[PDB]
Design an enzyme around this catalytic site. Structure first.
Site, mmCIF file in Angstrom:
data_model
loop_
_atom_site.group_PDB
_atom_site.id
_atom_site.type_symbol
_atom_site.label_atom_id
_atom_site.label_comp_id
_atom_site.label_asym_id
_atom_site.label_seq_id
_atom_site.Cartn_x
_atom_site.Cartn_y
_atom_site.Cartn_z
ATOM 1 N N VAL A 173 0.857 -1.179 0.000
ATOM 2 C CA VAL A 173 0.000 0.000 0.000
ATOM 3 C C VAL A 173 0.896 1.232 0.000
ATOM 4 O O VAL A 173 1.612 1.494 0.975
ATOM 5 C CB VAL A 173 -0.958 0.006 1.198
ATOM 6 C CG1 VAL A 173 -1.785 1.269 1.200
ATOM 7 C CG2 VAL A 173 -1.860 -1.215 1.156
ATOM 8 N N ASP A 174 0.855 1.991 -1.095
ATOM 9 C CA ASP A 174 1.597 3.236 -1.207
ATOM 10 C C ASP A 174 0.905 4.309 -0.369
ATOM 11 O O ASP A 174 -0.189 4.087 0.147
ATOM 12 C CB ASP A 174 1.702 3.649 -2.675
ATOM 13 C CG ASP A 174 0.348 3.835 -3.327
ATOM 14 O OD1 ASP A 174 -0.262 4.908 -3.142
ATOM 15 O OD2 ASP A 174 -0.109 2.904 -4.023
ATOM 16 N N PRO A 175 1.540 5.472 -0.172
ATOM 17 C CA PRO A 175 0.864 6.536 0.596
ATOM 18 C C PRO A 175 -0.483 6.964 0.028
ATOM 19 O O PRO A 175 -1.427 7.185 0.797
ATOM 20 C CB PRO A 175 1.886 7.678 0.561
ATOM 21 C CG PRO A 175 3.195 6.985 0.490
ATOM 22 C CD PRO A 175 2.970 5.773 -0.373
ATOM 23 N N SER B 219 -2.567 5.163 -1.946
ATOM 24 C CA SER B 219 -3.492 4.062 -1.709
ATOM 25 C C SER B 219 -3.911 4.015 -0.247
ATOM 26 O O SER B 219 -5.065 3.707 0.067
ATOM 27 C CB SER B 219 -2.855 2.740 -2.130
ATOM 28 O OG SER B 219 -2.493 2.767 -3.498
#
Ligand SMILES: CCCCCCCCCCCCCCCCCC(=O)OC[C@H](COP(=O)([O-])OCC(O)COP(=O)([O-])OC[C@@H](COC(=O)CCCCCCCCCCCCCCCCC)OC(=O)CCCCCCCCCCCCCCCCC)OC(=O)CCCCCCCCCCCCCCCCC
Ligand SMILES: CCCCCCCCCCCCCCCCCC(=O)OC[C@H](COP(=O)([O-])OCC(O)COP(=O)([O-])OC[C@@H](COC(=O)CCCCCCCCCCCCCCCCC)OC(=O)CCCCCCCCCCCCCCCCC)OC(=O)CCCCCCCCCCCCCCCCC
Ligand SMILES: CCCCCCCCCCCCCCCCCC(=O)OC[C@H](COP(=O)([O-])OCC(O)COP(=O)([O-])OC[C@@H](COC(=O)CCCCCCCCCCCCCCCCC)OC(=O)CCCCCCCCCCCCCCCCC)OC(=O)CCCCCCCCCCCCCCCCC
Ligand SMILES: CCCCCCCCCCCCCCCCCC(=O)OC[C@H](COP(=O)([O-])OCC(O)COP(=O)([O-])OC[C@@H](COC(=O)CCCCCCCCCCCCCCCCC)OC(=O)CCCCCCCCCCCCCCCCC)OC(=O)CCCCCCCCCCCCCCCCC
Ligand SMILES: COC1=C(OC)C(=O)C(C/C=C(\C)CC/C=C(/C)CC/C=C(\C)CC/C=C(/C)CC/C=C(\C)CC/C=C(\C)CC/C=C(\C)CC/C=C(/C)CC/C=C(\C)CCC=C(C)C)=C(C)C1=O
Ligand SMILES: CCCCCCCCCCCCCCCCCC(=O)OC[C@H](COP(=O)([O-])OCC[N+](C)(C)C)OC(=O)CCCCCCCCCCCCCCCCC
Ligand SMILES: CCCCCCCCCCCCCCCCCC(=O)OC[C@H](COP(=O)(O)OCCN)OC(=O)CCCCCCCCCCCCCCCCC
Ligand SMILES: Nc1ncnc2c1ncn2[C@@H]1O[C@H](COP(=O)(O)OP(=O)(O)O)[C@@H](O)[C@H]1O
Lengths: 70, 230, 116, 17, 50, 167, 98, 175, 450
Positions: G53-55, G57
């Site tokens: 999970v990216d920032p 997302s």
């Protein structure tokens, strides 16, 4: 709202239920009704109503409005 | 998870039947006075004359589409079909046909035709121009391509329900971005641009003509994948 | 004969108007003579508001209401000049030619929406 | 003149009761 | 009329805010309260005049 | 999204998938001859009323063949005038329930007859119309289990769950 | 009624919502994201980077979690979350979680 | 239900910590509270920086409603005739009669009933029977309108009498 | 029920302080305190104006009895007061103070700003404040002192202008409000402006009818939106609502009835009171263009806010939060006792609507019937506005027809305009076309053929 505890020493009315509220309602309604009945009689002593249907005010009767005699 | 069975006085599903007229629910039983029961019980509907009358009236089976692929009749001998409207074009034509009966009927039957016109003018300018009429003017009812001219034949709907076909050069066609025509025509795209593709807007730049295509319209792969149209 | 006259052609005195409790709105108009018997009959015939609101003949109060309704029609027509106004509306050119009322006809404009 | 919206350290020298 | 600024949120916000009448009245009321009670009454009135 | 059309044909060796037991016959005349088929047709008359007057796009399918080479369906549908043949591209068919089928029409539909299969509505997104089958019918178990009819080939989340929204 | 005696505030378990239910709902919501490959690899001890999970997302998932749990989460608290366990603990201990 | 919730937390009423000097120049400009102190005036429309910018925006956006009111007035002005409105002409000795009667009798400037050599004019609230302003304009307009309506009714009666006489002459003359 | 100006002032101060306590019910919040204090400040200004008017009356007549003042104020029409460098008419100054006091309480433009902020009070408090009582106090001041305002030029100029401006402003802002309570508050402001206009028409019966209809239906609508807000868990904006018809069926249906009555939709009692208001509107005002335009635009504004409130609350998409819907739809909750409201609330609203209908019908029969049976209103200013109600001319009928067709066009707009994409967009246009054609043919057949 979710109920939360109330201090026992505080005389507040939050979530206050009196198990004997029926007799309290009786003894707070009926004497109040009697007091208001007495006040109602006293105020009905001083009460004014216009003439009923089919009734006219005789201008020369004492009931008719009067003017100052200088 | 329901626990209505645990109790006797609890409400049953049969009590929740008056709500069927208000709440959608799969059918459970047919009532005595239901339309299906009436039609299947009265013997007058079993007679051949009623059956023949029903089988030869109302919508015909010839007009029902029999496939997911349709080839409309060619506008020209050499032209090939590209795009056609399906239902929005029909609704637009039926709405603009109201001007052929209601407008003369308003003149001949209203006590105050001037009052009718005086109320219709702001209705058109404030609500109806940007709702139906201007979209209809820019609506592409049909689009074919004539290859000998290397042009596109666009069939559109006119005022009284008319149909008229105009020819536009392919090389003069340009793509008009919605953001390019977003602010200057916001009212039209607010109340009258939902049935057409706002992300697929074209323009004949020679005359400034706008081409809007219905979202439900049908496109031919052969016509779309043509070297003239790339 | 006159519309303001009641059935008995009787004029009511100030004391009778006071005793019968005539509303001031009716008192301002000329229809007290026909309104008073109607109110007397309605007092003698107490009916619910639904009966008054639904009955077209006003039930028992038939003749009194007929006289009062004639008087009311004439009174509200004259307070409105509605006879002259409707005469000029039906045919503005003919009314001006006949001179029904030059005072009203000199400042009458029908309007564009109403057949010009 | 108006109060300062900026966060300030608690006063060290102030009149008291 | 194909372009209408009465459907953009700017006009909708303006009308929903009651034509900014409350905002303008409250700004002027704050102006009055500051310039009269504090600077003019307790400071000029009490600190200086009294 | 875009209704791009592709030319289709028939395989000449169709595989039967569905057959209405009551509506077995050449057409409306033999349906009249059958006592039960006539009663079902009379019960379907209000269905045709919803189809025509209320502009509810719907078809009552009485037969259905399958052509796997072209990936097409060969529905035979019943209307108030008789039986009509329709060909449906396999990628244009999505599952829809009774509630979606009913709520599609803004008009209140008449009370449906008990023989309509309410659990098996099938929406043609290209034509934007529902297909309703009959409860008492023969579903060819071998035919429906064709590899081209498997959801692993047919299931598309965006088309099946997000394409048709009724607001 | 009240026992007529002094009764103090009951801290109980310290969770205003079921921690396991909150954790399961949050993990289901995370798995709904297109960039979360393996729902079965998600653990309370797992990190957002570990579960891919990216920032951005994370921002989207947390906004949808706020919509789901009937609460709003301050950006400082959202940046304070280092693990799914921390997120679940913060949500469950919130008095407004629903 | 389904969970044994603890009691309502003390965080429901967070304690406010003063981080700034409470200036005497902001006296009572704040609603002071140990939980959620506020400014005495709330500005939900703070997208307008000042009250002058707010006035400019209000007058700029109210122009649309000015135009709409103008359109409505024009529509009702080119399509509607003024009505015959006024006081009830069957009762002119009432509201109109009493006004002119009071302005005519001048009973407020009479001599004192004891000979005190003071009249109504000797007061801060004194009568003025030669004022000619205020509601008198409306009273005169109402009286003029009532006279105009009476004249219209008289003209209508004269017209109908003239028409009847003309018809009688026409039928009798031919014989 | 005041008989003197002292009982009147006592009631004024009492309603002010009790409204302050009602608005400031959430005493723990200073955010409620500021709104309650704004209301308190406006009430104190109203008290100042009322006290000064009563003082002028007492210094003029040495009398405080309302009947005696009303029956003798005509003697003091030709009087002036030497206030500073000006000689103001006696009736003019008293009317100015009474009218300012009325405008502050009965919220008019400028002095209205406390009413939208007074929605921090609980829903029953807002229902009592807005339907009648606090906002009807100025109407009571105007009606009780009717002979005073008949002889005022300031009243003649300020009542219709301010009433029309207030009606237009309130109706227009209510047509744009997303909060239910704020929507109803601005509707109350609009109807108070309309009441001021109705008083300016010279007919007090119309004022009474409008007051009764507005109070009853505004109270019922307030109760309905209060149930809706409680179900939505203290979120009043309908941008977080939708699909509440299934969860609040009785609220949906009762709200429909009360909104179609309240907004003055045709074939309803609100339509009757609006028509009566337009019957008696005087046309001799200098600012009649602005007044009439504002009245028209405020009368057509009821459709917008009524439709928006009803549709957005009940039949829009599910814009609310999932917790609101799911928790009330669990299969275990399915029982004969299931309800998102209270049976007592439902019975109270039903009986309120029934009694409102009965009382409004009784008042209509007492006033609007051919046999005028209403009691004396103690007013000697009788105009001819009843003539157009009894025997109207064709021009007035055509003007009210213009208004009716404006309302019809607005109904067509709100019903058929598609602001969002939908699967039914094409079929909606088809329905509009076939409805237009059907209406034309229905008019043709019902008027000429048969
Ligand atoms: C292609 C074909 C083209 C030609 C098509 C021709 C056919 C007509 C087409 C259009 C039909 C249409 O529009 O139908 C709408 C609609 C049909 O509704 P539906 O969805 O078919 O369901 C009907 C209900 O179930 C009916 O309710 P129920 O079955 O539960 O019984 C209640 C019913 C009947 O009342 C009772 O049963 C009460 C008495 C019981 C004891 C009787 C002994 O009462 C009513 O319907 C009340 C409404 C007023 C009826 C008249 C008075 O028509 C009606 O509802 C009208 C009344 C129908 C018959 C009932 C009354 C008979 C007297
Ligand atoms: C005798 C009585 C006659 C009564 C007539 C009443 C009206 C009848 C219908 C008129 C149709 C012709 C006008 C029209 O619609 O042209 C379409 C034409 C289409 O151009 P567009 O590029 O699509 O639109 C450009 C934008 O309007 C943006 O354009 P812009 O930014 O360049 O200009 C701003 C825009 C501003 O537009 C507005 O303010 C329009 C306000 C009304 C409509 C608002 C929208 C309503 C529907 C949407 C929902 C809104 C909810 C809130 O237009 C103006 O300011 C022009 C003057 C506006 C009227 C001023 C007052 C005129 C009457 C004075 C009467 C005095 C005696 C009493 O629009 C205009 O020309 C704009 C003005 C429209 C109203 C003009 C009315 C003139 C009446 C006197 C002649
Ligand atoms: C064929 C007709 C073609 C033309 C009609 C339109 C066709 C569809 C396109 C337009 C769609 C649309 O806009 O729909 C809106 C609207 C309904 O839309 P919706 O809300 O979506 O509801 C869909 C269904 O209608 C859902 O139906 P529902 O079951 O929910 O009920 C709706 C409707 C359906 O029911 C009816 O229309 C009943 C009409 C009478 C049928 C029975 C007559 C005999 C009764 C026994 C003997 C007496 O019922 C009513 O409107 C209530 C009628 C109450 C009657 C009793 C009260 C008065 C008497 C009380 C006692 C004294 O359409 C209608 O209301 C009309 C439906 C179709 C016509 C039904 C009536 C039969 C044909 C006309 C008969 C006229 C009188 C006889 C003379 C005939 C000429 C010689
Ligand atoms: C009697 C009438 C005589 C003729 C008057 C002029 C008629 C033609 C006006 C055409 C429209 C001009 C315009 O900019 O419209 C935008 C304006 C709204 O602008 P917006 O883009 O929505 O917002 C701009 C921002 O607020 C930001 O505002 P901004 O920074 O762009 O500054 C412009 C703003 C503020 O104006 C200024 O700063 C100019 C200096 C004003 C000083 C104080 C003057 C008093 O003024 C307006 O937006 C409206 C000016 C209305 C002038 C007439 C007022 C009467 O729309 C209209 O004015 C529509 C037409 C409404 C009717 C105009 C005539 C009023 C009387 C009608 C019945 C007779
Ligand atoms: C849309 O509102 C507005 C609000 O919401 C109520 C607001 O909150 C605010 C915000 C205000 C503040 C923050 C404080 C300001 C305080 C106020 C009280 C401002 C209120 C402003 C208004 C109510 C708008 C008024 C502005 C205009 C332009 C009037 C609108 C009406 C028209 C344009 C109609 C045009 C009329 C014409 C052309 C008449 C022409 C004459 C004839 C046809 C002759 C007829 C013959 C007769 C005998 C009749 C006599 C008629 C006369 C003499 C005309 C006089 C009338 C006039 C209007 C001039 C603003 C700015 C606003 O803007
Ligand atoms: C010189 C030009 C002559 C022709 C001008 C034509 C202008 C009007 C064009 C649109 C016509 C279609 C709309 C009206 C259809 C008939 C409706 C009817 O019964 O009218 C009776 C009346 C006929 O009665 P009348 O005109 O004989 O007289 C009584 C009516 N008054 C007193 C008000 C004049 O029709 C009208 O008043 C027509 C008003 C039209 C206003 C503009 C409408 C725009 C919106 C279109 C959709 C309307 C949907 C239906 C609305 C009504 C029903 C709910
Ligand atoms: C002449 C004197 C008239 C006094 C009565 C009229 C006062 C009008 C201004 C009211 C005002 O500014 O109110 C602001 C404040 C409450 O307003 P607000 O913060 O909006 O609260 C609603 C909930 N948020 O309320 C207050 O600040 C109340 C105190 C107002 C003091 C008088 C201001 C006079 C301005 C001229
Ligand atoms: N006494 C004061 N003087 C000036 N400004 C203040 C005062 N109290 C609060 N404010 C303003 O109100 C805002 C509220 O801040 P606050 O909530 O107290 O701090 P934090 O946001 O860190 O909790 C601050 O940003 C400040 O600008």
């Amino acid at each position: 709202f979710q109920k939360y505890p109330i201090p026992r020493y505080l005389h507040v009315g939050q979530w206050i239920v009196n198990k004997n509220w029926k007799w309290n309602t009786f003894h707070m309604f009926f004497p109040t009704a009697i007091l208001c009945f007495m006040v109602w009689r006293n105020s009905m002593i001083s009460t004014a109503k216009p003439p009923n249907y089919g009734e006219y005010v005789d201008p020369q009767s004492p009931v008719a409005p009067k003017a100052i005699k200088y | 998870g329901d626990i209505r069975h645990k109790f006797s006085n609890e409400i049953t599903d049969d009590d929740y039947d008056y709500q069927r007229a208000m709440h959608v629910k799969p059918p459970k039983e047919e009532s005595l006075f239901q339309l299906t029961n009436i039609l299947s019980s009265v013997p007058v509907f079993k007679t051949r004359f009623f059956l023949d009358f029903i089988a030869r009236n109302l919508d015909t089976n010839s007009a029902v589409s029999t496939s997911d692929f349709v080839a409309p009749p060619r506008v020209h001998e050499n032209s090939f079909f590209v795009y056609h409207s399906r239902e929005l074009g029909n609704v637009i034509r039926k709405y603009r046909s109201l001007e052929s009966i209601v407008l003369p009927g308003a003149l001949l039957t209203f006590t105050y035709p001037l009052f009718a016109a005086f109320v219709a003018i702001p209705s058109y300018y404030f609500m109806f121009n940007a709702k139906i009429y201007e979209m209809s003017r820019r609506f592409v009812v049909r689009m074919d391509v004539l290859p000998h001219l290397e042009m596109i034949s666009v069939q559109r709907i006119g005022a009284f329900g008319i149909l008229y076909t105009k020819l536009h050069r392919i090389q003069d066609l340009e793509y008009v971005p919605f953001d390019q025509v977003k602010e200057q025509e916001n009212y039209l795209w607010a109340i009258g641009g939902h049935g057409v593709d706002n992300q697929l807007i074209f323009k004949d730049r020679s005359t400034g003509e706008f081409f809007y295509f219905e979202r439900q319209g049908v496109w031919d792969a052969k016509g779309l994948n043509h070297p003239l149209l790339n | 004969g006159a519309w303001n006259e009641n059935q008995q052609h009787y004029k009511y005195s100030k004391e009778e108007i006071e005793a019968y409790q005539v509303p001031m709105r009716i008192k301002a108009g000329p229809c007290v003579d026909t309104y008073i018997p109607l109110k007397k009959c309605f007092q003698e015939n107490p009916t619910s508001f639904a009966a008054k609101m639904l009955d077209g003949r006003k039930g028992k109060c038939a003749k009194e209401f007929k006289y009062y309704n004639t008087c009311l029609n004439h009174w509200q027509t004259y307070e409105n000049n509605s006879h002259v106004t409707n005469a000029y509306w039906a045919d503005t050119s003919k009314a001006n030619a006949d001179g029904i009322s030059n005072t009203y006809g000199g400042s009458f404009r029908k309007g564009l929406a109403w057949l010009n | 003149y108006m109060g300062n919206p900026a966060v300030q350290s608690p006063p060290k020298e102030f009149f008291n009761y | 009329m194909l372009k209408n600024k009465l459907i953009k949120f700017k006009f909708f916000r303006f009308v929903q805010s009651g034509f900014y009448v409350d905002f303008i009245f409250k700004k002027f009321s704050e102006m009055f309260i500051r310039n009269i009670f504090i600077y003019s009454s307790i400071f000029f009135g009490e600190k200086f005049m009294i | 999204y875009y209704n791009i059309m592709r030319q289709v044909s028939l395989d000449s060796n169709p595989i039967v998938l569905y057959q209405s037991s009551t509506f077995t016959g050449n057409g409306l005349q033999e349906f009249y001859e059958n006592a039960d088929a006539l009663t079902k047709y009379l019960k379907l008359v209000p269905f045709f009323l919803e189809k025509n007057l209320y502009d509810h796009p719907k078809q009552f399918v009485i037969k259905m063949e399958f052509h796997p080479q072209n990936k097409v369906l060969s529905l035979d549908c019943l209307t108030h005038q008789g039986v009509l043949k329709k060909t449906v591209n396999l990628e244009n068919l999505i599952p829809v329930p009774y509630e979606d089928y009913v709520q599609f029409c803004r008009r209140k539909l008449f009370n449906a007859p008990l023989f309509l299969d309410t659990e098996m509505i099938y929406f043609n997104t290209f034509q934007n119309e529902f297909y309703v089958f009959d409860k008492n019918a023969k579903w060819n178990e071998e035919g429906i289990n064709h590899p081209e009819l498997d959801i692993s080939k047919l299931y598309n989340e965006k088309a099946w769950f997000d394409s048709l929204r009724i607001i | 009624y009240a026992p007529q005696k002094v009764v103090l505030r009951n801290e109980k378990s310290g969770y205003y919502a079921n921690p396991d239910d909150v954790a399961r709902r949050l993990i289901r919501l995370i798995s709904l994201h297109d960039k979360v490959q393996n729902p079965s690899a998600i653990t309370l001890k797992s990190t957002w980077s570990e579960i891919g999970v990216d920032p951005l997302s994370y921002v989207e998932i947390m906004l949808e979690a706020e919509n789901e749990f009937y609460i709003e989460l301050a950006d400082e608290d959202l940046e304070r979350f280092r693990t799914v366990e921390d997120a679940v603990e913060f949500i469950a201990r919130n008095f407004f979680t629903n | 239900h389904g969970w044994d919730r603890p009691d309502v937390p003390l965080s429901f009423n967070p304690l406010y910590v003063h981080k700034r000097e409470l200036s005497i120049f902001d006296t009572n400009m704040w609603m002071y509270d140990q939980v959620y102190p506020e400014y005495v005036i709330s500005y939900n429309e703070i997208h307008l920086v000042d009250q002058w910018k707010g006035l400019k925006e209000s007058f700029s956006q109210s122009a649309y409603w000015w135009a709409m009111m103008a359109m409505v007035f024009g529509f009702y002005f080119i399509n509607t005739t003024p009505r015959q409105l006024g006081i009830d002409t069957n009762d002119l000795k009432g509201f109109l009669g009493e006004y002119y009667g009071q302005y005519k009798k001048r009973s407020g400037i009479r001599s004192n009933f004891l000979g005190l050599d003071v009249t109504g004019e000797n007061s801060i609230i004194q009568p003025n029977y030669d004022r000619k302003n205020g509601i008198r304009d409306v009273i005169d307009s109402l009286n003029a309108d009532a006279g105009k309506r009476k004249l219209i009714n008289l003209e209508a009666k004269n017209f109908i009498e003239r028409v009847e006489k003309e018809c009688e002459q026409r039928i009798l003359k031919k014989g | 029920s005041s008989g003197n100006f002292i009982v009147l002032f006592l009631g004024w101060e009492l309603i002010g302080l009790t409204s302050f306590f009602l608005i400031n019910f959430w005493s723990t919040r200073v955010g409620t305190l500021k709104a309650a204090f704004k209301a308190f400040s406006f009430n104190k200004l109203s008290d100042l104006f009322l006290f000064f008017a009563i003082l002028i009356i007492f210094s003029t007549t040495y009398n405080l009895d309302i009947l005696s003042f009303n029956n003798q104020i005509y003697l003091y029409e030709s009087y002036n007061i030497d206030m500073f460098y000006w000689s103001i008419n006696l009736i003019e100054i008293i009317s100015f103070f009474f009218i300012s006091c009325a405008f502050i309480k009965s919220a008019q433009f400028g002095a209205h700003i406390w009413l939208p902020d007074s929605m921090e009070a609980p829903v029953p408090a807002s229902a009592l404040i807005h339907s009648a009582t606090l906002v009807s106090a100025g109407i009571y001041l105007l009606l009780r002192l009717s002979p005073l305002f008949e002889l005022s030029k300031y009243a003649y100029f300020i009542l219709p202008l301010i009433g029309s401006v207030t009606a237009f402003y309130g109706g227009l802002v209510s047509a744009f409000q997303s909060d239910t309570k704020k929507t109803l508050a601005y509707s109350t402001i609009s109807h108070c402006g309309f009441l001021m206009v109705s008083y300016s028409t010279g007919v007090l019966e119309f004022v009474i009818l409008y007051l009764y209809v507005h109070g009853f239906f505004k109270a019922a609508t307030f109760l309905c939106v209060g149930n809706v807000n409680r179900f939505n868990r203290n979120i009043q904006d309908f941008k977080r609502m939708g699909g509440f018809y299934k969860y609040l069926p009785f609220e949906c249906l009762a709200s429909f009835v009360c909104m179609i009555n309240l907004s003055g939709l045709p074939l309803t009692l609100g339509f009757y009171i609006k028509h009566l208001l337009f019957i008696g509107l005087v046309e001799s005002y200098t600012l009649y263009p602005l007044i009439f335009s504002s009245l028209i635009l405020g009368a057509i504004a009821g459709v917008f806010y009524s439709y928006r409130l009803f549709y957005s609350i009940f039949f829009d998409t599910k814009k609310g939060k999932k917790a609101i819907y799911l928790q009330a739809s669990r299969i275990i909750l399915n029982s004969k006792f299931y309800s998102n409201t209270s049976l007592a609330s439902n019975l109270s609203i039903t009986f309120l609507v029934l009694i409102s209908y009965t009382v409004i019908l009784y008042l209509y029969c007492t006033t609007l019937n051919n046999y005028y049976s209403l009691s004396d209103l103690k007013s000697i200013y009788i105009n001819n506005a009843y003539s157009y109600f009894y025997k109207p001319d064709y021009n007035f009928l055509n003007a009210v027809s213009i208004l009716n067709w404006f309302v019809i066009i607005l109904l067509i707009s709100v019903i058929y305009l598609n602001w969002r994409w939908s699967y039914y967009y094409t079929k909606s246009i088809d329905s509009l076309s076939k409805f237009i054609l059907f209406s034309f043919f229905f008019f043709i057949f019902s008027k000429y053929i048969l």
